[PDB]
Paper text:
The major psychoactive cannabinoid component of medicinal cannabis from the plant Cannabis sativa is Δ9-trans-tetrahydrocannabinol (THC), which can bind to CB1 and CB2 in a low nanomolar regime. ATX binds to THC at the entrance of the hydrophobic pocket with the aliphatic chain pointing into this pocket. The binding of the THC molecule is driven by hydrophobic interactions of the residues I167, F210, L213, L216, W254, F274, Y306, and V365, as analyzed by the PLIP server. THC works as a partial inhibitor on the catalysis of both isoforms. The apparent EC50 value of THC with ATX-β and LPC 18:1 as a substrate is 1,026 ± 138 nM, as shown in Fig 2A. A similar magnitude of inhibition is observed with ATX-γ, with an apparent EC50 of 407 ± 67 nM for THC toward this isoform. It revealed that THC functions as a mixed-type inhibitor, which is demonstrated by the decrease in Vmax from 8.5 to 7.3, 6.3, and 5.0, respectively, and an increase in Km from 10.1 to 19.6, 29.9, and 31.5 µM, respectively. However, the authors are aware that a comparable water molecule also exists in the ATX-THC structure, where the distance between the THC oxygen and carbonyl oxygen of F273 is 4.5 Å, thus above the PLIP server threshold for such an interaction.
Autotaxin (ATX; ENPP2) is an extracellular glycoprotein, which hydrolyzes lysophosphatidylcholine (LPC) into lysophosphatidic acid (LPA) by cleaving off the choline head group. ATX consists of four domains, two repetitive N-terminal somatomedin B–like domains (SMB1 and SMB2), followed by the catalytic phosphodiesterase domain (PDE) and an inactive nuclease domain (Nuc). The active site of ATX constitutes a bimetallo zinc coordination center and the active site nucleophile, Thr209, in rodents. A nearby hydrophobic pocket, which extends into the PDE domain, accommodates the lipid substrate aliphatic chain; in addition, there is an allosteric tunnel that is formed between the SMB2 and PDE domains, where an oxysterol and bile acids bind.
Author numbering: 56 to 65, 73 to 395, 403 to 569, 589 to 858
The structure:
């Protein structure tokens, strides 16, 4: 009936007993003491223990394990941890009975990466962690850039569509229930998928501290509890801890991210970090523990003034439910009728509607029943609401909020912070930006844990660590290619078309892609390009070619515009045919290697082979022809040549994964020719642009995209203007990681380079965001 001698144990006395309350009567005395505040005065040094004080400055406190964190500094002349110089920590300096260096996760809500430039005058402790440890210039959250999806992504390594927490608010039709940030419903385990770090640790024998705190527990008491847990005996001491602060999120919403008011919470956060680090040094654990300082998302300038209203677009908005704000999700209280009515209606429309299946694949935001079919992507700095009355402002007439977040995760104001400090991290080291889905694997490596299956790429962050790295193994190739010669006569071919090799390894710079599923396919060589041609899908899985800086673009001759040629290397039974296209009134065809870039009049005939052809809507051909005729030459001219790999993607169930043949739902009329949902291109060059793409020594440079194969250009409100005004903007919107294309294709890229595999894993997880 009492919490005596079991405050914050690992009637309830735990961190959450207050949350939907359940604490023993005496919890607020024994466990939430507060007298004297949280720091030692030189006036109470050597005091006589008063059991009402929050923390203690008696000399028995080091033996009783309850000093204030500044006790050695004020009462024994030691320095603050922040006043010591960086000293490289080569090994963990831990007590003898420690089996692994502990991990402390210090998570900050809404910490914009830019905040790191307010400097040591605002955040000396944080700036010391950043400069002496390992830090990225920023870390990319997942979409939507909201608190709960992103904190749970950090804990699991999973996209929201997979771990289930797809928003701060969501409706689950199978439960017929709603989930919100406030309320008891979030406490029900039915909402939460994947396997969070605290569960991974416990299942593998690694004790976790309680990661969560009832809101009425002050930040100073949370830090004190973590330090007192670290002083437990060997068989009780947890190995992993978490501290969370709702700041600077609250102030960023109220005053906006550029408000002078922002330095107040930024200082209070930095003092809490100082309290942690002084406490660790007091325990002489400051060279033993790995510390992670990480944010969930950034913060953007948003105001009531900048709101789009559905009631300006729909005739009746009272018959729909809208999840509003920095994103939109719509359900009923006709779907493409609603989409049509929201599509390009106002000149500078500050949101775009999507069926979720048509969102950029890099968002990975569709494969979950809690994600509504209709999605609105909202311009940064802007809000979307159902109707004007939903915008609440102070009686002062001023807006209630000046900052918000939730936008597309390539928005620079949404990027957040990563710093790692301690024995396992590198010393005074800066690493490139990375996505937060990669962090779960790192924390597992820091703890000696085997990660649960997740969406990180294990080994892509090895450069963050000085030890305990994961050694990735390149996957074995599963399908071996055929190399067909001339096996067939031009006379054997029906098809209904008409038409008036190791030099070729200037076109395959990084080895052939490995095919990681079982299938039959052929390598085909040509003067200008190489392809892996699938006998099952009747088209290339990949087409690879190199365009040098000085390449010339030619046209498609008038006498060749409608030319398709049979390929004598490939059976007529394993080729496409032109009858299907003539009979498919909506489908045209295009070519993966562009005829525009042929090296000679004779070579160009290769580009018209039936094995180079892929099904394309006319509306998509406007995009593809512009990319092939205009943009490839541009990139090659900018990057001292480029190597391009292009191919189809089939993802009819929108799970981000290569469809089997059973899942493909659309074929060219009267044929077995499957229709791709997307087309990809990977564009590689030398990071050192003074070396040409085909003669690159060191690191590589990549940009990639996954373009939706649509029968219209309704996504592009300016598509009626010249293609130079919209096509490249559409391509930047559909940028992707090479790793994204690998999931969607079953291919494995960059297998023959002079780079280490871990370096290559990093390359494949880069996303060019512009
Ligand atoms: C807002 C504050 C009161 C804190 C609210 C905390 C609440 C969101 C936390 C507290 C308990 C957590 C669950 C607990 O760890 C058990 C698991 C098992 C794991 O496999 C899936 C996640 C789950 C359900 C945790 C979800 C988050 C919880 C509810
Ligand atoms: C993200 O990672 C999860 C976990 O590995 C993947 O989800 C698994 O997908 C397989 C194959 O479809 C299923 O058999 C498992 O049941 C899934 N597990 C979970 C926890 O959902 C998911 O496919 C990955 N997403 C991407 C885009 O790669
Ligand atoms: C690795 C970065 C931190 C991960 C650990 C971590 C800590 C943490 O306190 C939370 C995490 C995850 O996610 C959920 C479960 C969404 C919590 C929601 C409610 C509150 C108050 C805090 C959140
Ligand atoms: Ca046609
Ligand atoms: Ca799929
Ligand atoms: Na439940
Ligand atoms: Zn947040
Ligand atoms: Zn917020």
């Amino acid at each position: 009936g009492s919490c005596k001698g079991r405050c914050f144990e690992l009637c309830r006395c735990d961190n959450l007993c207050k949350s939907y309350s359940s604490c023993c009567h005496d919890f607020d005395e024994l466990c939430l003491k507060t007298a004297r505040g949280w720091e030692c005065t030189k006036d109470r040094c050597g005091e006589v223990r008063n059991e009402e004080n929050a923390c203690h400055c008696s000399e028995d406190c080091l033996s009783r394990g309850d000093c204030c964190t500044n006790y050695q500094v004020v009462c024994k002349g030691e320095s603050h941890w922040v006043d010591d110089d960086c000293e490289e920590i080569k090994v963990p300096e831990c007590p003898a009975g420690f089996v692994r260096p502990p991990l402390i996760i210090f998570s900050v809500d809404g910490f914009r990466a830019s905040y790191m430039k307010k400097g040591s005058k605002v955040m000396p402790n944080i700036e010391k962690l950043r400069s002496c440890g390992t830090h990225a210039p920023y870390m990319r959250p997942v979409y939507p850039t909201k608190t709960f999806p992103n904190l749970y992504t950090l804990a699991t390594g999973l996209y929201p569509e997979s771990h289930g927490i797809v928003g701060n608010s969501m409706y689950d039709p199978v439960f017929d229930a709603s989930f919100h940030l406030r309320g008891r419903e979030k406490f029900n385990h039915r909402w939460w998928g994947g396997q969070p770090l605290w569960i991974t640790a416990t299942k593998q024998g690694v004790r976790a501290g309680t990661f969560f705190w009832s809101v009425s527990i002050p930040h100073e008491r949370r830090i004190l509890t973590i330090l007192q847990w670290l002083s437990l005996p060997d068989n009780e001491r947890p190995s992993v801890y978490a501290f969370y602060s709702e700041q600077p999120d609250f102030s960023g919403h109220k005053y906006g991210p550029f408000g002078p008011e922002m330095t107040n919470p930024l200082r209070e956060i930095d003092k809490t970090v100082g309290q942690l680090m002084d406490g660790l040094k007091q325990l002489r654990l400051h060279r033993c523990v790995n510390v992670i300082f990480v944010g969930d998302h950034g913060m953007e300038d948003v105001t009531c003034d900048r709101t789009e209203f559905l009631s300006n677009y729909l005739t009746n908005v009272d018959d729909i439910t809208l999840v509003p704000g920095t994103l939109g999700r719509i359900r009923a209280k006709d779907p493409k009728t609603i989409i049509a009515a929201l599509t390009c209606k106002k000149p500078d429309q500050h949101f775009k509607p999507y069926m979720k299946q048509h969102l950029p694949k890099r968002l990975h935001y569709a494969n979950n029943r809690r994600i509504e079919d209709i999605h609105l992507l909202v311009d940064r700095r802007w809000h979307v609401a159902r109707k004007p009355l939903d915008v609440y402002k102070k009686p002062s007439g001023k807006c209630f909020f000046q900052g918000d977040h939730g936008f597309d995760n390539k928005v620079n104001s949404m990027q957040t912070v990563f710093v790692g400090y301690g024995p396992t991290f590198k010393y005074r080291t800066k690493v490139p930006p990375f996505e937060n889905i990669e962090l779960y694997n790192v924390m597992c490596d820091l703890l000696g844990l085997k990660p649960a299956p997740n969406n990180g790429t294990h080994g892509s962050l090895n450069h963050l660590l000085r030890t305990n790295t994961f050694r990735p193994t390149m996957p074995d190739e599963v399908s071996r290619p055929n190399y067909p010669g001339i096996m067939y006569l031009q006379s054997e071919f029906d098809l209904g078309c008409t038409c008036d090799g190791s030099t070729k390894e200037r076109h395959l710079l990084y080895g052939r892609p490995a095919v990681l599923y079982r299938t039959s396919y052929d390598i085909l060589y040509h003067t200008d390009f190489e392809s892996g041609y699938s006998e099952i899908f009747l088209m290339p899985l990949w087409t690879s070619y190199t365009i040098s800086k000085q390449a010339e673009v030619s046209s498609i001759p008038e006498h060749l515009t409608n030319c398709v040629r049979p390929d004598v290397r490939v059976s007529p039974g394993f080729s496409q045919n032109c009858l299907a296209y003539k009979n498919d009134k909506q489908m045209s065809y295009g070519f993966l290697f562009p005829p525009y870039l042929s090296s000679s009049p004779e070579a160009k005939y290769d580009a018209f082979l039936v094995t180079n052809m892929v099904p394309m809507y006319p509306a998509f051909k406007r995009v593809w022809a512009y990319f092939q005729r205009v943009l490839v030459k541009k990139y090659a001219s900018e990057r001292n040549g480029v190597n391009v790999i292009s191919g189809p993607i089939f993802d009819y169930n929108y799970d981000g994964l290569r469809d089997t043949e059973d899942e493909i739902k659309q074929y060219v009329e009267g044929s077995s020719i499957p229709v791709p949902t997307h087309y990809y291109s990977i564009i590689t060059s030398c990071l050192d642009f003074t070396q040409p793409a085909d003669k690159c020594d060191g690191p590589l440079s990549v940009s990639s995209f996954i373009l939706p194969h649509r029968p219209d250009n309704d996504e592009s409100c300016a598509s009626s203007e010249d293609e130079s005004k919209w096509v490249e903007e559409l391509m930047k919107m559909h940028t992707a990681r090479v790793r994204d294309i690998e999931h969607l294709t079953g291919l494995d890229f960059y297998r023959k380079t002079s780079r280490s595999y871990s370096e290559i894993l990093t390359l494949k997880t880069y996303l060019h965001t512009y």
